[PDB]
Each structure stands twice: as structure tokens, then as C-alpha cells.
Amino acid sequence: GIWEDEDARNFYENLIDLKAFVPATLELGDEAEDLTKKLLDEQSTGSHLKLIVDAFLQQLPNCVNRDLIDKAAMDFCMNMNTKANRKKLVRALFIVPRQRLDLLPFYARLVATLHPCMSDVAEDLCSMLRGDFRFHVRKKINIETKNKTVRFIGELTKFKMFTKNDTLHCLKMLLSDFSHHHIEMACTLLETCGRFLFRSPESHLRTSVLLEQMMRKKQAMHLDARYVTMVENAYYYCNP
């Protein structure tokens, strides 16, 4: 049993089969989202189409349930699919605000639902999310933005848009320099998709090794109490 509920099994595994359809100090989030937002802002059957796409993107933040987000996918796939439009979608998905963590699972569902008939949405978003992750792992920018990036990767992992091996590499990078911001990013990552990784047979053994290395490290490396407790809680959350 990989999932807790039956709602979870269905939210992550029962997607609408779209392939049945027609072939048709700084003023910042992070620097990555600011740069992406400015690319979006810079820019007549296409002026009508642009209009309906800008409507569509501006409505995404309201698709707060399973039925609403699946509809959005059908709407996009049937009236708006266009190289230029796929790039705008990817970029609107990537600049999700940190204050709407609740969107991440729906945004991941959209991406995974589109993937079988326009994979490049997944490819671009993942590539963007990977690069921002690398950036966060190198610096020391508010922990709350970093946690948005890591949560989004987690949701995408549960949908298999990131492979187990991808996200395990993320975790391994954070365990190499096990410092304050990296410990939290790690614990956020494991809260989001650690059980998926631990329970899945393909990833179980490597997750477990890494979980035990984190526990070994809280004692061994004398972290201050707050992070000792953080690591423990993420551990017992995956491996109770």
C-alpha cells in the first residue's frame, strides 16, 4: 500500500486519458520567478487566441479541486495548444506564489495529465525546477521560497514527472552539506514525497539508506536541537 487513502490513489494514479482526443536586497519569490514573470509580461485570430489564453492562465489559481483541474486540461488541450502557448503555460505554472502551496498538487496533476500528448510541458517545468533547486542548494534567500520549489518537485515525483532517481539525487545533494537551510529543504521534500519513495519497491532500499544516514548525522554532526527534532520528525513520518 503506497497511498494512505483511496482519494490519494485516485488523485495520483487515475488521470483523464486525453490521448483519446483530436491530434490538434532585491524586489522579488526568487530571482528565477522574477525573471520568468518579466518574460511573460513582455507580450488577429491570434490576438483572440492570446486573449483566451491570458484568461485561462489567470483562472488557473482558482482550479482548487480534481474536477476543476481536469477540465482545465481538456480546455487547454482542445482550444489553446500551440508551442507559444505551451511556453506560457509552463511559465505560469512555475511562478505559483509561495502563499498558494495548496495549488501545487493540482498544478502537478495538470502537467501529468497533459504529458502523454504534449510531454514538453513536463520537460520544461522540470528543467526549470531542477535549475532553481541547484540555485537554492548553492546559496544562503527566504526558506519559504525554497520550500515551494522543493514541494513542487515532491508533487511532480508522486506523479512520476520526476523519476525516483531524480528526486533521490536531490535528497543526496542536500545530505552532502547538511546545514541549516539544506536540512529544512530535505525535511520538506520528505514530507511531500518520502512515503511514496519509501513504500515504492524500486526506491525503498535507497530511501531507507538515506533516511538512516540523516538519523546517524543528527547525533554525529551535533546539529542544534531544533534541527535534531526536524530530522526525527521527517524520519518517523516516512518510516513509522
Residue numbers in the entry: 457 to 480, 529 to 532, 534 to 548, 559 to 655, 658 to 757
Passage from the reporting paper:
Nonsense-mediated mRNA decay (NMD) is a eukaryotic mRNA quality control mechanism that recognizes transcripts with premature termination codons (PTC) and promotes their degradation. Human UPF2 (Q9HAU5) is an ∼140 kDa protein containing three conserved MIF4G (Middle portion of eIF4G) domains that are found in a number of proteins involved in RNA metabolism and translation such as the nuclear cap-binding protein CBP80 and eIF4G (eukaryotic initiation factor 4-gamma). UPF2 interacts via its third MIF4G domain with UPF3b and via its C-terminal extremity with UPF1, thus forming the central component of the ternary complex of UPF proteins. Here, we present the atomic resolution crystal structures of the N-terminal (MIF4G-1) and middle (MIF4G-2) domains of UPF2 and a lower resolution crystal structure of the combined UPF2 MIF4G-2/MIF4G-3 domains.
The first part of this N-terminal region (458–478) folds into two short α-helices (hA and hB), which together with the connecting loops pack against helices h2, h4, h6 and h8. The interaction is mainly hydrophobic, involving Ile458, Trp459, Phe467 and Tyr468 of helix hA and Pro620, Phe621, Phe676 and Phe713 of h4, h6 and h8. Two salt bridges are also established between Glu460 and Arg712 and Arg716 on helix h8. Residues 481–558 following helix hB are largely disordered in the crystal structure (apart from the short helix hC) and indeed this region is highly variable between species. In fact, residues 458–478 are evolutionarily conserved within UPF2, and the expression of MIF4G-2/3 constructs lacking this capping region yields mostly insoluble protein. Notably, superposition of MIF4G-1 and MIF4G-2 shows that the capping helices hA and hB in the two domains pack against the same region of helices h2, h4, h6 and h8. We solved the structure of UPF2 MIF4G-1 and MIF4G-2 domains at 2.6 and 2.4 Å resolution, respectively, using SAD on seleno-methionine substituted protein crystals.
